[PDB]
């Protein structure tokens, strides 16, 4: 099938870093806001050469004209939210899940949590829980995925290569698993 890969998120949330590491192999220290574009990645799936339609677009409301164009017919959406910031996750449940359900019709949906390396940073957690928030864990993300009826919660981080290989191979294979 024509499976599309979509990465969304607010600015300076780690999208550019992991995206450039996976796409080409460099870690940019600068966060460059991506408006709307697509990259190609060669991943071996089932012993077959698969090219990934790595659609990219910033999650800001200013870009509501171009970002919805490629959402349809997408298997895995990499909603980039900070683990240490549950407000971003609440915004994911509030708006992004609704939009993904709105566009992704008849295609499996996978929820992805970014920044696995900074899952439990005490300083940021303390400075973001001053307003009465809670820590976010892998089980918390899986709970969110279960509530929204997602086909799976796979965490990948191209910064250190965690997950990306197996997670993306499974995403290609999720078109058949369902």
């Amino acid at each position: 099938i024509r499976r599309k890969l979509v990465i969304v998120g607010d600015g300076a949330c780690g999208k550019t870093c992991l995206l450039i590491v996976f796409s080409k192999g460099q870690f940019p220290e600068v966060y460059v806001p991506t408006v709307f574009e697509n990259y190609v990645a060669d991943v071996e799936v089932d012993g077959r050469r698969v090219e990934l339609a790595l659609w990219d677009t910033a999650g800001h409301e200013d870009y509501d004209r171009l970002r919805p164009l490629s959402y349809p017919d997408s298997n895995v959406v990499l909603i980039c939210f900070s683990i240490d910031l549950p407000d971003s996750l609440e915004n994911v449940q509030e708006k992004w899940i609704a939009e993904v359900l709105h566009f992704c019709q008849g295609v499996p949906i996978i929820l992805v949590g970014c920044k696995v390396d900074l899952r439990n940073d005490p300083q940021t957690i303390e400075q973001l829980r001053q307003e009465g928030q809670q820590p976010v864990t892998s089980q918390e993300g899986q709970s969110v995925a279960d509530q929204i009826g997602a086909t799976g919660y796979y965490e990948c981080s191209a910064k250190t290569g965690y997950g990306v290989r197996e997670v993306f191979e499974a995403a290609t294979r999720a078109s058949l698993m369902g």
Binding site: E90, N91, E94, K95
Partner: protein, 1492 residues
């Protein structure tokens, strides 16, 4: 020819050779270091201007006219700036403008002589220097006067010996990097900021921002120029003129510029700028009201009547003084004009004193006691002086009201007259027509207003002023408020009529404009009754006369042939569009089928023209409508054309951002194994089925390809997998769907039309080519490329996707002529530096690089990113430097154009009034400004479009976007578009600068609040002539203010109706028939007859109905397609909550009180209007025909209420009240109190009506027996808030330990319950009477709203207390929202009760334009059972809540009926807290002579 610029190059009379122009441009670039590529672009621009200008006049005349237009002429912005700043002649220019409606003449003569002495090379040098500066200005282009100052400095530098001495050229890019770059940095810093190496947006009040205009204004006045200081501190003025250009870079701008126009609350702006409207309306209303109120000015006299009317002039002077104080507030004191404001205030106060003096003399009671004829004559003369004052202040503009008298040394005018007051006066019968229209409007308005005032209020004023009531009243002040109750009713009535007095004027304005439009239609003679057969019969001759320039060319051939060729081209265009059938096209074509040997057989007139009945056109075809409109346009008078080679050069500008270039094959055809909606290709087919079917079935494409000649006498897709077929499908879909490619084709029709005209008019070229068709095509294409240029701006090209890049490459390949302008970026040479951004242009001719990107023809470097603010204006600005020609056409991303509209392009350009006029020397010594006829150019041009009535209404909606622009005029002044964040702002800037705006009906194009604070509105309202001012005011702001006044009058009428209903209910009234004598003994003895008051209610209902109907005719008219023959619930409610839903409900409650208190037929109309207002969103929204749908929506609403209690959620009630608080969030504090005051007035009025109800009018007066209703209001108002505070404290400090979202919802429910309980307690206290309770609860709600507004106002001026107040207000808001939604759902219930409303839903679907069907996906049985369980649960809960409320309402009434009323044991000052009497007579009448 064979030259890039044939007109100037070929003529041997040209004074300057192209090589000399190139040399002078290069010399300027060397001396000032303009970018070489920018120099090349501006050299091309200047040569194109010379070619276009010289094509229609002699070369030297063309160069002279260009010099005059750009710098030297009276129409040159540089001259205006030079006189405003260097010569400091603004006040003299204001003097001259006022008259038209050492010394200036001497300076103008010196300037003209200086210009005349110039040789042609010097004129070229001046123009080239200006054009280079303008090209390099970049963002400074919007601040035109800054550009003019930089140009002055550059000229001074160049002419100085120091510049000539230097032998080392200035480094390339010095201009941009030194002069423009600092100013761009200043503008950018005023908006944005940098964080962590990333550029972030910064927001501040616009009062704190220094925008483009504020930067611009500093250069208008010489004092503003003097404020400029270098970094070291020395003033820029101290330097000699030759040194200034070099030192310009050394200047620091941040502390030099400043804010010139300061903005504050809206009502201050409305008072200041529109002062004349308020003066005339209010003063005349006072005079009418004074003349008609004998009781008010008569003790227990003609002199008093006349004197009281003279107060109208005093009111006018007061309005003027208040407007002057607001004006003083707006502008800073140091800036030029403050001293004039002080003097104007002094003059106005003196006039006020003069108006007051004699009136105070007459007022003196000792003078009245001994009547004197002197006092009577004083009163009369004072009245006439007051009328003169009202006229004078209604006519004269506020700006420079007394300026002529002063002749002051300082600057007399507040605003620079050269740039703010230069309006082009109306000339000829047009100005007289405007005078007559406005005189008619005001005469009719005042006559009608006096008729209505006398008729409606002559009796009510008498009755309510002279009638005194009988009641015990409240304990604290029982006596004092019943005796004035009718007076309060009368005051409210007068206020309501005062508001209505304004709507009358807009009504009359619309009526009179309609009548004048019909009159103009009669004068023109175009009548719908005229047979269309006649218009079509005359069409060929009209085409011969107008579409072709035949008088210019020698008449060697019959007209028949030329018009036949034009019509054949038109019809072949139609056929290529596929809108016409082959047979129909054949009937519409001048037939050449018969033998060409015989002249008659060679050309045969179309069947379509000769016959006129037969279906020549397919029914409901765009082609038939287009042809009919073409004929209609040809009927009207239009300017004569001129030969194509003589036509001026113009350009078409198109910006876009993310628009779809061409339809993707994926969009057209989709995968088989899916189901969603209907395939878009088939949807479009259904849209135009015949058009789609004809060309595929009959192969009409190739048949039309052959017919165009007419013998020369004139695996993705399952159904197909042929590439050419895919291209054809994509082209067709793009043509029939909104697409950029459709606009590109429609506007290449311009080039096609120009080619056609050049071929038709000049057969000599065709003979010369002698059958060489390819060479003929090449030559015609040369002409088309020379005359017409298409430019489309794309700021996205650097970031285009592969498919978008492919689409753009296809676009360029289709039309090699086309031009594109885009932006590209590069990294800096030094590390740690901002990226470098250039602007580039490409057209199809540019060779394609190896990497696939097209080579840029021009690169221009910009100091920074051109998109400083989010708006289309900057997108246009970064690209227009590449425009060519003398005229520009603006279009948005999507528009449609046709060959017939293109043929008339020569006429459209002609109406700018430059082509057909004779040329004279603008520097002749004898000529004088007053004698010149070129003072006011045509800056902008706009294009516009039982049966007679519909035409009237269409004109009504039409009357009120620049579609063409005078390139030079708008380029030198400001920019083509100046949103600087819209079109109206650009048009108003053109009007202020001095240009004119014209509208043409022969060319039609299809396209598919904050203003009140703008400085332009202030200038226009403060400085326009009276008639022009009225035109402007009732065009643009009149609509908004009329709507606001409609809402205000609705609220005021509801308040008056509440008070009047209370008065009627508590009183006993007496009615009389018309036959029965007007003056007679009252039918019941001792009765007050208030029937005229309810008659006034009826009259007011009729008046508001008329106004609403007139305001609604345009909206229904817009739905012409229907013709005369014919969703989240919570999100929707929040959307329209605060949009007159809360006000709608409150007014509905007041109307219900009035309805129960008294019944009058007009209130039924108000009931219908309010019900429509409340339920409109809930009736026109879809999915209504489903019980499950309603229960899902109700569940979503309950979730919306519950969300945010424990964990914040954006889509929740908490979030929305937070949003409202945020949107609400010294002297400005006083302005805030100004808005809170009206709410206090409404609360007081409702409270007074409530007190009326409880005053016990008809009951026998009982000594020391009184009812403390005000204490009732106090208790019922404080108790809910007090309980909210108590429960909040309890939750905060109690039971928190015993933990085992529910708690917050519990608190909200408790607050709701307490509100309901206190409403019940109010009903109990009223003794279970329903009407007194209704008014009491309305008053309680008003008091709570007033308290909340007071708390908010205090918050805007300790933190835990503030948060506590916010929480409390939010709790009350939750209670209100919950009850409102609950009643909404109650009203929803009956619709659900109906077994099947499918018929209503189907009718609604027919009404709805989209007409779309949607079906839900399949669901699992367990999930379906869960959904059914949820439906059962939530419907049960909804019915439970409904039953709880229904019991809460009815049950107390049943209990009260069951248990008899009783009152007892009231002491300690609180007497009869519960409403005193169980039984009451309330009927005092008869009683022989005695009353009461």
């Amino acid at each position: 020819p064979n030259e890039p610029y044939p007109a100037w190059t070929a003529d041997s009379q040209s004074p300057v050779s192209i090589e000399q122009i190139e040399d002078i441009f290069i010399d300027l670039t060397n001396r000032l270091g303009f970018q070489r590529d920018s120099m090349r672009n501006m050299f091309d621009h200047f040569m194109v201007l010379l070619d276009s200008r010289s094509s229609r006049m002699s070369p030297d005349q063309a160069l002279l006219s260009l010099h005059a237009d750009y710098i030297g002429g009276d129409t040159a912005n540089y001259k205006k700036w030079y006189f405003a700043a260097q010569l400091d002649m603004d006040d003299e220019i204001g003097f001259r403008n006022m008259s038209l409606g050492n010394s200036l003449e001497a300076a103008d003569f010196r300037w003209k002589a200086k210009m005349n002495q110039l040789s042609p090379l010097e004129r070229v040098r001046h123009i080239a220097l200006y054009l280079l500066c303008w090209g390099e200005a970049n963002q400074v282009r919007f601040t035109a006067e800054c550009l003019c100052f930089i140009y002055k400095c550059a000229l001074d530098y160049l002419d100085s010996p120091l510049c000539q001495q230097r032998q080392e050229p200035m480094p390339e890019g010095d201009f941009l990097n030194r002069v423009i770059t600092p100013i761009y940095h200043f503008i950018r810093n005023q908006v944005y900021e940098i964080v962590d190496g990333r550029f972030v947006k910064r927001e501040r009040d616009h009062n704190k921002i220094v925008g483009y205009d504020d930067l611009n204004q500093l250069f208008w006045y010489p004092e503003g120029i003097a404020k400029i200081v270098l970094e070291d501190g020395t003033k820029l003025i101290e330097l000699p003129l030759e040194e200034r250009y070099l030192r310009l870079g050394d200047v620091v701008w941040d502390d030099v510029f400043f804010k010139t126009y300061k903005e504050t609350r809206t009502w201050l702006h409305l008072v200041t700028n529109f002062n004349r409207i308020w003066v005339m309306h209010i003063s005349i209303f006072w005079m009418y009201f004074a003349y008609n109120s004998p009781t008010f000015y008569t003790h227990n006299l003609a002199a008093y009547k006349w004197a009281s009317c003279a107060l109208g002039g005093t009111v006018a002077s007061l309005i003027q003084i208040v407007a002057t104080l607001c004006e003083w507030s707006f502008v800073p004191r140091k800036w030029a004009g403050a001293q004039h404001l002080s003097r104007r205030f002094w003059f106005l106060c003196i006039i006020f004193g003069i108006n007051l003096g004699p009136i105070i003399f007459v007022f003196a009671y000792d003078k009245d006691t001994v009547y004197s004829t002197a006092a009577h004559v004083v009163a009369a003369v004072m009245f006439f002086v007051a009328v003169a004052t009202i006229i004078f202040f209604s006519i004269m503009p506020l700006g420079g009201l007394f300026t002529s008298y002063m002749k002051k040394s300082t600057r007399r005018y507040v605003a620079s007259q050269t740039f703010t007051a230069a309006f082009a006066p109306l000339h000829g019968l047009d100005r007289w027509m405007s005078y007559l229209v406005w005189v008619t409007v005001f005469a009719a308005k005042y006559s009608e207003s006096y008729y209505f005032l006398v008729l409606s209020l002559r009796d009510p004023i008498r009755i309510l002023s002279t009638t005194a009531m009988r009641c015990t009243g409240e304990y604290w002040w029982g006596a004092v408020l019943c005796k004035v109750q009718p007076k309060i009713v009368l005051g409210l009535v007068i206020a309501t009529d005062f508001i209505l007095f304004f709507l009358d004027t807009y009504l009359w304005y619309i009526i009179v404009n309609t009548i004048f439009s019909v009159g103009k239609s009669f004068y023109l003679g175009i009548s719908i009754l005229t047979p269309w057969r006649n218009i079509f019969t005359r069409l060929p001759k009209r085409i011969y006369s107008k579409i072709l320039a035949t008088t210019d060319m020698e008449i060697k051939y019959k007209p028949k042939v030329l018009i036949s060729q034009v019509w054949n081209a038109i019809i072949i265009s139609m056929y290529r569009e596929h809108l016409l059938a082959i047979d129909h096209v054949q009937k519409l074509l001048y037939h050449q089928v018969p033998s060409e040997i015989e002249g008659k057989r060679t050309l045969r007139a179309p069947t379509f023209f000769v016959s006129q009945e037969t279906e020549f056109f397919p029914r409901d075809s765009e082609a038939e409508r287009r042809i009919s409109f073409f004929a209609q346009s040809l009927s009207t008078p239009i300017p004569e054309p001129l030969p194509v080679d003589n036509m001026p050069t113009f350009t078409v500008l198109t910006p876009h951002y993310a628009e779809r270039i061409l339809l993707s094959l994926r969009e057209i055809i989709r995968e088989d194994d899916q189901f969603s909606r209907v395939t878009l290709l088939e949807y479009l087919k259904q849209l135009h089925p015949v058009e789609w079917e004809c060309f595929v079935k009959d192969t009409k494409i190739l048949a039309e390809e052959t017919a165009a000649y007419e013998g020369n006498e004139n695996c993705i897709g399952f159904k197909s997998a042929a590439p050419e077929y895919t291209l054809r499908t994509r082209i067709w879909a793009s043509l029939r769907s909104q697409t950029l490619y459709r606009t590109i084709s429609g506007f290449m029709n311009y080039s096609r039309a120009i080619k056609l005209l050049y071929r038709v008019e000049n057969p000599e070229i065709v003979q010369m080519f002698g059958g060489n068709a390819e060479g003929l095509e090449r030559e015609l294409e040369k002409m088309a490329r020379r005359k017409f240029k298409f430019l489309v701006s794309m700021q996205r090209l650097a970031k285009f996707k592969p498919h978008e890049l492919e689409n753009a490459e296809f676009l360029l390949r289709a039309y090699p002529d086309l031009q594109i302008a885009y932006l590209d970026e590069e990294p800096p040479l030094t590390e740690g530096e901002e990226p470098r951004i250039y602007s580039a242009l490409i057209d199809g001719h540019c060779e394609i690089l190896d990497n696939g990107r097209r080579r840029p023809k021009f690169r221009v470097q910009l100091s920074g990113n051109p998109i400083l603010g989010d708006g289309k204006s900057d997108n246009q600005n970064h690209a227009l430097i590449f425009y060519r020609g003398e005229y520009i056409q603006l279009i948005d991303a999507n528009q449609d154009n046709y060959l017939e509209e293109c043929l008339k392009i020569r006429s459209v350009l002609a109406e700018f009034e430059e082509l057909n006029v004779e040329q004279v020397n603008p520097y002749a010594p004898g000529l004088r400004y007053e004698e010149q006829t070129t003072n006011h150019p045509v800056a902008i041009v706009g294009a516009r479009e039982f049966g007679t009535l519909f035409a009237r209404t269409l004109s009504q909606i039409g009357g009120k976007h620049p579609d063409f622009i005078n390139a030079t005029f708008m380029t030198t002044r400001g920019g083509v578009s100046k949103a600087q964040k819209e079109d109206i702002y650009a048009g108003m800037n053109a009007m202020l600068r001095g240009g004119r705006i014209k509208h043409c009906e022969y060319y039609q194009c299809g396209k598919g609040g904050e203003q009140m604070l703008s400085r332009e509105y202030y200038y226009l309202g403060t400085q326009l002539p009276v008639d022009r001012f009225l035109t402007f005011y009732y065009a643009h702001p009149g609509f908004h203010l009329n709507n606001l006044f409609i809402q205000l009058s609705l609220q005021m009428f509801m308040l008056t109706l509440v008070n009047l209903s209370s008065l009627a209910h508590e009183s006993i009234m007496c009615i009389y028939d018309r036959n029965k004598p007007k003056t007679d003994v009252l039918v019941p003895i001792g009765c007050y007859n208030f029937q005229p008051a309810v008659d006034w209610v009826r009259r007011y209902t009729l008046s508001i109905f008329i106004v609403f109907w007139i305001a609604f005719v345009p909206i229904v008219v817009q739905e012409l397609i229907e013709r005369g023959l014919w969703i989240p619930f919570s999100i929707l409610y929040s959307r329209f909550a605060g949009s007159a839903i809360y006000m709608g409900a409150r007014s509905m409650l007041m109307l219900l009180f009035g309805t129960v208190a008294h019944w009058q037929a007009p209130l039924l109309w108000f009931w219908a209007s309010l019900s429509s207002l409340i339920f409109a969103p809930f009736v026109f929204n879809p999915h209504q025909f489903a019980w499950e749908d309603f229960f899902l929506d109700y569940r979503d609403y309950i979730r919306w209420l519950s969300r945010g209690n424990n964990q914040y959620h954006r889509n929740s009630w908490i979030g929305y009240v937070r949003m409202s608080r945020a949107r609400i969030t010294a002297h400005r504090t006083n302005l805030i109190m100004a808005e809170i005051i009206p709410c206090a007035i409404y609360a007081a009025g409702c409270f007074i009506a409530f007190t009326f109800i409880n005053a016990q009018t008809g009951v026998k007066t009982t000594d020391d027996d009184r009812v403390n209703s005000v204490l009732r209001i106090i208790i019922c108002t404080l108790a809910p808030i007090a309980v909210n505070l108590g429960v909040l404290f309890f939750c905060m400090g109690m039971s928190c330990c015993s933990g085992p979202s529910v708690m917050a919802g519990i608190a909200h429910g408790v607050a709701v319950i307490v509100h309901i309980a206190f409403f019940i307690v109010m009903w109990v206290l009223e003794s279970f009477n329903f009407v007194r309770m209704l008014i009491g609860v309305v008053t309680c709600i008003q008091c709570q709203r007033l308290i909340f507004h007071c708390m908010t106002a205090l918050m805007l001026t300790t933190q835990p207390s503030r948060e506590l107040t916010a929480k409390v207000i939010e709790l009350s808001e939750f209670a209100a929202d919950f009850v409102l939604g609950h009643v909404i759902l109650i009203c929803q219930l009956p619709l659900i009760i109906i077994p099947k409303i499918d018929k209503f839903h189907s009718i609604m679907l027919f009404w709805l334009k989209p007409s779309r069907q949607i079906r839900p996906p399949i669901y699992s049985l367990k999930q379906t059972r869960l959904r059914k369980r949820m439906v059962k649960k939530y419907c049960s809960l909804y019915f439970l809540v409904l039953a709880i409320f229904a019991g809460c309402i009815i049950g107390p009434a049943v209990a009260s009926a069951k248990i008899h009323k009783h009152i007892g044991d009231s002491l300690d000052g609180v007497v009869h807290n519960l409403f005193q009497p169980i039984n009451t007579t309330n009927n005092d009448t008869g009683s022989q002579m005695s009353t009461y």
